[PDB]
Design an enzyme around this catalytic site. Structure first.
Site, PDB file in Angstrom:
ATOM      1  N   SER A  32      53.423  68.572  11.344  1.00  0.00           N
ATOM      2  CA  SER A  32      52.767  69.220  11.082  1.00  0.00           C
ATOM      3  C   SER A  32      52.188  69.547   9.890  1.00  0.00           C
ATOM      4  O   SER A  32      51.108  70.820   9.304  1.00  0.00           O
ATOM      5  CB  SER A  32      54.225  71.027  10.870  1.00  0.00           C
ATOM      6  OG  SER A  32      55.014  71.215  11.913  1.00  0.00           O
ATOM      7  N   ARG A  86      63.748  66.339   1.598  1.00  0.00           N
ATOM      8  CA  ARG A  86      62.185  65.944   1.540  1.00  0.00           C
ATOM      9  C   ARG A  86      61.721  66.320   0.589  1.00  0.00           C
ATOM     10  O   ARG A  86      61.789  65.637  -0.340  1.00  0.00           O
ATOM     11  CB  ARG A  86      61.780  66.171   3.239  1.00  0.00           C
ATOM     12  CG  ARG A  86      61.744  65.555   4.393  1.00  0.00           C
ATOM     13  CD  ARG A  86      61.268  67.003   5.176  1.00  0.00           C
ATOM     14  NE  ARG A  86      61.301  68.181   5.061  1.00  0.00           N
ATOM     15  CZ  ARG A  86      60.526  68.863   6.514  1.00  0.00           C
ATOM     16  NH1 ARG A  86      59.807  68.787   7.068  1.00  0.00           N
ATOM     17  NH2 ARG A  86      61.516  69.939   6.422  1.00  0.00           N
ATOM     18  N   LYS A  91      48.641  70.789   9.768  1.00  0.00           N
ATOM     19  CA  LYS A  91      48.105  71.978   9.579  1.00  0.00           C
ATOM     20  C   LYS A  91      47.406  72.519   8.795  1.00  0.00           C
ATOM     21  O   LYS A  91      46.750  73.005   8.352  1.00  0.00           O
ATOM     22  CB  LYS A  91      49.168  73.633  10.371  1.00  0.00           C
ATOM     23  CG  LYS A  91      50.405  73.432  10.843  1.00  0.00           C
ATOM     24  CD  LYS A  91      51.772  73.941  10.875  1.00  0.00           C
ATOM     25  CE  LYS A  91      51.642  74.822  12.119  1.00  0.00           C
ATOM     26  NZ  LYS A  91      53.081  72.889  12.399  1.00  0.00           N
TER      27      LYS A  91
HETATM   28  O1  LIG Z   1      57.915  68.479  17.703  1.00  0.00           O
HETATM   29  C1  LIG Z   1      57.772  69.588  17.577  1.00  0.00           C
HETATM   30  O2  LIG Z   1      56.920  70.231  18.131  1.00  0.00           O
HETATM   31  C2  LIG Z   1      58.128  70.348  16.005  1.00  0.00           C
HETATM   32  C3  LIG Z   1      59.281  70.381  16.577  1.00  0.00           C
HETATM   33  C4  LIG Z   1      60.201  70.827  15.292  1.00  0.00           C
HETATM   34  C5  LIG Z   1      59.562  71.662  14.059  1.00  0.00           C
HETATM   35  C6  LIG Z   1      59.569  72.179  12.641  1.00  0.00           C
HETATM   36  N1  LIG Z   1      60.458  70.637  11.726  1.00  0.00           N
HETATM   37  N2  LIG Z   1      60.618  71.595  10.873  1.00  0.00           N
HETATM   38  C7  LIG Z   1      61.669  72.407  10.378  1.00  0.00           C
HETATM   39  C8  LIG Z   1      62.945  72.420  11.193  1.00  0.00           C
HETATM   40  C9  LIG Z   1      63.137  71.889  11.928  1.00  0.00           C
HETATM   41  C10 LIG Z   1      64.220  71.817  13.071  1.00  0.00           C
HETATM   42  C11 LIG Z   1      64.959  73.008  13.387  1.00  0.00           C
HETATM   43 CL1  LIG Z   1      66.016  74.083  13.954  1.00  0.00          CL
HETATM   44  C12 LIG Z   1      64.299  74.239  11.921  1.00  0.00           C
HETATM   45  C13 LIG Z   1      63.380  73.549  10.771  1.00  0.00           C
HETATM   46  N3  LIG Z   1      61.699  72.247   8.995  1.00  0.00           N
HETATM   47  N4  LIG Z   1      60.131  72.421   8.729  1.00  0.00           N
HETATM   48  C14 LIG Z   1      60.058  71.774   9.328  1.00  0.00           C
HETATM   49  S1  LIG Z   1      58.100  71.260   9.508  1.00  0.00           S
HETATM   50  C15 LIG Z   1      57.417  71.159  13.594  1.00  0.00           C
HETATM   51  C16 LIG Z   1      57.346  70.325  15.963  1.00  0.00           C
END
Ligand SMILES: O=C(O)c1ccc(/C=N/n2c(-c3ccc(Cl)cc3)n[nH]c2=S)cc1
Ligand SMILES: O=C(O)c1ccc(/C=N/n2c(-c3ccc(Cl)cc3)n[nH]c2=S)cc1
Ligand SMILES: [Cl-]
Lengths: 242, 241
Positions: free
Chosen positions: B46, B226, B49
């Site tokens: 991400s 992070r 983005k």
């Molecule tokens: O492979 C994917 O389609 C994908 C999986 C998780 C995310 C998000 N990740 N993430 C998260 C996140 C990940 C898991 C949970 Cl349950 C809540 C927030 N917080 N910050 C971020 S960046 C984005 C894309």
């Protein structure tokens, strides 16, 4: 459309203070204040004038961008943070009057007057010194008038370029976290009675924006932190921020 | 570049490992705990983005930061994704399906050209046009992230000034009287090794410190590390209080 909430006075009186907080819910187009009369009383804007001054300075090219450095003139003034170089970001942050006084002189009274009329800003009156009228001249603005002006800026509806408005909103950045963003400007009017403090701006949420303008009596600089503290207590009470 | 391995203590405190990379803009000097991992290229996940937003805005796929992208009605695992979004909130909550639709409108031809113009990572978009930054061929290192972010900060990317200003607004993460952080999180889970990213910069009154970090991330439970580990490094280096 408007609601008076006297319970907010509890945030003022506990600090042996007097003043007004005005909130505007943008989604609902509804206003709230502890004091309807004071919400509509007008005061010298003092350093809250740095918002329209910045806009005008940028649109006329007096300020090229937010990185341009305005070198210290070498005059030691009472506020230590003023005695050094600044750009637009830090000059706003530290309310650096001499930087903006130079902006005002370059803008000139004719263009300044024309622009404030275009902005529908306060009483639109710049009588006095072109480089201090917002501190000891004829200009006056109320808390509700501050909000009207700020709503135009938020929506890029003022009669300056979109870029000028985006840069000033960047320079207004005051606080941000995972719950909210505050864009605002402090002010402190000391030259002409009554001495007062200001805090005007807005709170960005995920799905709404709350505009605010507050002013309070400020007999000494001791209570300047109360501008933000009392506003935040009101925001907390109204569940706008945690 | 200077290596400071003492930062590794901040990783081992949480039984983790990874890299933080800092760039002092005034002094044009870099610092990292791990020079080799600093240059190791991973899926951007991400953090992509940032360039995706830039491209979408410059092509008019996104009109402005207020335009609303309505939920398609598919209930996905992350609850904050199951609602309408604008550019600000889509970036905040890393809302992949919004950006997947952007990528489709953009198309592979324009995406490829733009990433080359951006000098972004290995500039390779092989895979699905709407998922290559998650499970495709694109790879970028922490140092390459900083190179890209420096251009964005200075409005030197080959898109309009307005596009760059809007994305930097949407990157806003934290601000107070001491500092401003503009950044983007990432979590790469589709292809091993699973890693977490945080890239961006810290604005001070008289300097800017760029940063890019990534760390091993076997479960989502450690995602908060992070930011936490990065801020421990920033605190140690006296960049933030
Ligand atoms: O492979 C994917 O389609 C994908 C999986 C998780 C995310 C998000 N990740 N993430 C998260 C996140 C990940 C898991 C949970 Cl349950 C809540 C927030 N917080 N910050 C971020 S960046 C984005 C894309
Ligand atoms: O009349 C003036 O020339 C003038 C005086 C104080 C200010 C700045 N006041 N102020 C201050 C302030 C005032 C006094 C001291 Cl000692 C420290 C900060 N914090 N925030 C704000 S706004 C601006 C203009
Ligand atoms: Cl911003």
């Amino acid at each position: 459309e408007w609601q008076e909430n006297k319970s907010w006075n509890a945030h003022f009186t506990e600090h042996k203070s007097q003043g007004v907080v005005v909130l505007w819910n943008e989604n609902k187009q509804q206003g709230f204040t502890n004091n309807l009369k004071r919400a509509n009383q007008a005061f010298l804007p003092a350093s809250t004038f740095k918002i329209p001054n910045s806009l005008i300075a940028l649109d006329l090219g007096v300020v090229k961008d937010e990185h341009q450095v305005f070198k210290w003139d070498g005059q030691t003034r009472d506020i230590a943070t003023w005695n050094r170089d600044h750009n637009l970001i830090t000059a706003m942050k530290y309310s650096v009057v001499p930087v903006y006084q130079e902006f005002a002189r370059q803008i000139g009274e004719a263009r300044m007057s024309k622009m404030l009329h275009a902005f529908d800003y306060g009483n639109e009156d710049i009588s006095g010194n072109v480089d201090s009228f917002w501190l000891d001249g004829g200009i006056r603005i109320s808390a509700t008038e501050q909000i009207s002006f700020l709503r135009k800026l938020y929506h890029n509806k003022l009669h300056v370029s979109e870029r000028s408005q985006r840069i000033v909103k960047q320079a207004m950045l005051t606080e941000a976290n995972g719950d909210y963003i505050i864009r605002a400007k402090t002010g402190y009017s000391t030259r002409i009675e009554p001495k007062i403090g200001w805090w005007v701006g807005w709170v960005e949420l995920d799905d709404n924006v709350w505009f605010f303008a507050m002013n309070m009596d400020m007999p000494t600089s001791d209570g300047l932190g109360l501008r933000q503290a009392i506003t935040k207590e009101v925001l907390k009470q109204e569940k706008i921020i945690p």
